[PDB]
Amino acid sequence: TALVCDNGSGLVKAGFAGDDAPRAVFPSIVGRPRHQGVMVGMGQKDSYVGDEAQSKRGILTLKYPIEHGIITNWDDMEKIWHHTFYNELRVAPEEHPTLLTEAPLNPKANREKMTQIMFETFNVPAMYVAIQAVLSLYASGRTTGIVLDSGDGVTHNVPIYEGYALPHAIMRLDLAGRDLTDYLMKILTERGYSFVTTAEREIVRDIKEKLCYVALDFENEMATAASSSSLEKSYELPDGQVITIGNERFRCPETLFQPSFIGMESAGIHETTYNSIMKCDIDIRKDLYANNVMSGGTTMYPGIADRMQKEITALAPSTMKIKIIAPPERKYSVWIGGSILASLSTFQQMWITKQEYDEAGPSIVHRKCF
């Protein structure tokens, strides 16, 4: 067995290769206390990690060590990996290879320090660093398609044909569920309700995860919510009081299809997918159009597969069929795909091994993992 540790920017998703689904899913958060620690003894800790922080958050400054899929704070990222292996999986990491992941078009130094900490702190016996939108394509049961992965921090497209990636046609967009959370705070502020702190940012994430949905036709949905009760509904806070919301429920997800709302100049996710298909060689485009693959938690909004199929069918030539593949387990497909990969018998030849790291130094990942 080998660990598969998809340290995403919003959730760590971890477990064992060939296991059905990730067994350690928790916030990619380190919390530190912000108040007068008056009661002596009491089992107090200098910092808290994951669900241990999320449940204590009313006294903590929660901060994610990872932003837009790039590690910003290594002293806390080691704290998350240590929590993953010793507290959440309860293994010794020196006994198991780890398949890690990262998004494409990351800094070189991210990939180096992430191999160095696995070999020099966690003492791991072998490791590998897969591209997240390649893994999501194993989890679809395919060898050609265009994975749209979108998580908490990054959205990216990787077009693949016959198992060859077309790396010139990879699109990264630094917009995903954390920007939709920050935008939901900016529009909730307009109805009556103020959310400000790093802990209140989790309450509005827990709104976004169950009140929001994607409108199939935003400009007509906007007129319908401005003229009826049916689109409005309510959520009950930790403080027992009720929050009622309406056109905020679909204006939030719409930022993915209209990044101009949060001040970005870019294509939306629909036109970013088409700009990746139209960068590919002309003979493969039909087999990409019939195999768009949704992945990552930001693709979980009710109606996003219907909307994505509508917007791509308007951009694509009407002569040919579009399919969006969106399984119900697309919430974890990058982990699911790493759990396939780390169990394929040729894969056991591809690991960076401890001995090979010791001899080659941390630059070995650049001449073995892609």
Ligand X SMILES: Nc1ncnc2c1ncn2[C@@H]1O[C@H](COP(=O)(O)OP(=O)(O)O)[C@@H](O)[C@H]1O
Name the residues that contact ligand BEF, by CB under 6 A: 8-10, 69, 151-154, 176, 296
User: Which stretches of 139-267 are DSSP H helices?
Assistant: 177-191, 200-211, 218-225, 248-254
Residue from 96, 208, 251, 307 binding ligand X (CB under 6 A): 208
Non-local (6+) Cβ contacts of 332 within 8 A are 13, 21, 22, 25
Is 101 an interacting residue with respect to ligand X (CB under 6 A)? no
Scanning the structure block, which residue is given the tokens 């003894």? 41
Is 59 an interacting residue with respect to another protein (CB under 8 A)? no
Torsions phi, psi of 268, nearest 5? Answer: -70, 180
Which of 201, 153, 200 has the alpha carbon at shortest distance from 177? Answer: 153
Is 50 an interacting residue with respect to Mg ion (CB under 5 A)? no
Residue from 81, 257, 274, 301 binding ligand X (CB under 6 A): 301
Tell the smallest beta-carbon distance from residue 199 to ligand X (Å): 15
Tell me the two tokens of residue 261: 């709302």
Q: Which stretch binds another protein (CB under 8 A): 5-13, 136-144, 190-198, 280-288?
A: 136-144
Residue 48 DSSP label: E
Binding at 259: pick from another protein, ligand X, ligand BEF, none (beta carbon under 5-8 Å per type): none
- Tell me whether residue 43 or residue 317 sits nearer to another protein (CB atom): 43
- Binding to Mg ion, residues 268-307 (CB under 5 A): 296
Is 93 an interacting residue with respect to Mg ion (CB under 5 A)? no
Is 22 an interacting residue with respect to ligand X (CB under 6 A)? no
Which of 217, 219, 244 has the alpha carbon at shortest distance from 231? Answer: 244
Q: Per-residue DSSP letters for 253-269? A: HHTTT-GGGGT--S--H
Is 8 an interacting residue with respect to Mg ion (CB under 5 A)? yes
User: Beta strand 98-102 with 324-325: parallel, antiparallel or unpaired?
Assistant: unpaired
- Tell me whether residue 121 or residue 260 sits nearer to another protein (CB atom): 121
Residue from 64, 81, 138, 193 binding another protein (CB under 8 A): 138
**What number of chain residues touch ligand X (CB under 6 A)?**
17
User: Beta strand 145-150 with 292-295: parallel, antiparallel or unpaired?
Assistant: parallel
CA-based torsion, 365, 1, 144, 101: positive or negative: negative
Is 201 an interacting residue with respect to ligand X (CB under 6 A)? no
Tell me the two tokens of residue 37: 């620690």
Is 135 an interacting residue with respect to another protein (CB under 8 A)? no
Tell the smallest beta-carbon distance from residue 335 to another protein (Å): 11
Is 211 an interacting residue with respect to ligand X (CB under 6 A)? no
8 A C-beta contact, residue 130 and residue 101:
yes
Residues that bind another protein (CB under 8 A): 18, 20-21, 41, 92, 121, 138-139, 141, 336, 339-341, 343-347
